[PDB]
Design a protein around this ligand. Sequence first.
Ligand code: MTA
Length: 377
Amino acid sequence: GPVIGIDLGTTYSCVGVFKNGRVEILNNELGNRITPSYVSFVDGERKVGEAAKLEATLHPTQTVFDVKRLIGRKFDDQEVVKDRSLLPYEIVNNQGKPNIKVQIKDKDTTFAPEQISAMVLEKMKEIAQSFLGKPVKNAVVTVPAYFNDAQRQATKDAGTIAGLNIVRIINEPTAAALAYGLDKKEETSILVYDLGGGTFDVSILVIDNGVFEVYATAGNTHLGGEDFDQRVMDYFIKMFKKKNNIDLRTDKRAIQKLRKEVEIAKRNLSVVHSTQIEIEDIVEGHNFSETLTRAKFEELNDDLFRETLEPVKKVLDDAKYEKSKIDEIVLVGGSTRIPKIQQIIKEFFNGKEPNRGINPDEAVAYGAAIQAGIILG
Ligand SMILES: CSC[C@H]1O[C@@H](n2cnc3c(N)ncnc32)[C@H](O)[C@@H]1O
């Protein structure tokens, strides 16, 4: 049968297939190659992807996301304690493990993380099945290099619930290295810098005659593009209050519309220097109309950008590496498109240029699909 490749991210998933010697990253029903990893339990309907994410504004307790943060962990782990204080849906202690509690037609329903991750995997499986026009029973799925055996097994269990035999778990750094086609001959040390929507991961990956080994990993579990958007949100909320005596935080719908336009403005500012943020009637009778510059975008976030270097120094220290020991720098995650991120990494490495792709949000899924192709021969 076919074997598909799935990047099960914290904020998103992405599915690719290997067919007729090419990787195709597939579109969901809304025509997008990235699917938000959200599941909503509102009004007797279950939604997965963007349609669930849209429910978060008016139904925050019924809209599940970031389940990757919980999968395979214990309820009393320090990281899960923090996530429970951050996440708006109820997390319960089931025999020492975090479970998710929502209502379906007002009835309390509890799910293991792998049950919610399975719903995400089912949607990715259906995209592949529709594209390939045949059933899919096997996948390569990605995990973070820091995932332990329980976190990997819980991911495989998510696959089994979705009717996917996970034939190989590959770490996210290896997937990136397969996607960029890094030479497998001889010995190469690679710094894989992965800045996503919610999480930052850095790894030292060494490739030695076709054998991949992650020598060290570090990161920031609560640092990504969503935090850069919030810094911009915070600034324009203060400004709109100064100018109009309106606190936009008082209207959740107003915040949802602003966040959407701020994320587009931020993407624009990876290519241009000035962009307009515009919402007609952000509240009734009050337009939002502002200019954001790249300089102001960077000023609002430059502490968060520089914080990404602390895990870089940690992995170099863990591996007993000089900066010079790194042969190539590979950027993954959409947020590596920010010009200042690229500049900061270049300058830390005493002037050495990072390799970046052109679809860095899809590189991990792409490498998972390559791994599927490798396994089939
Ligand atoms: C799945 S990675 C998606 C993350 O990358 C960010 N991202 C994608 N493209 C860009 C871009 N052009 N500039 C800045 N951030 C981007 C998105 O805003 C989100 O935070």
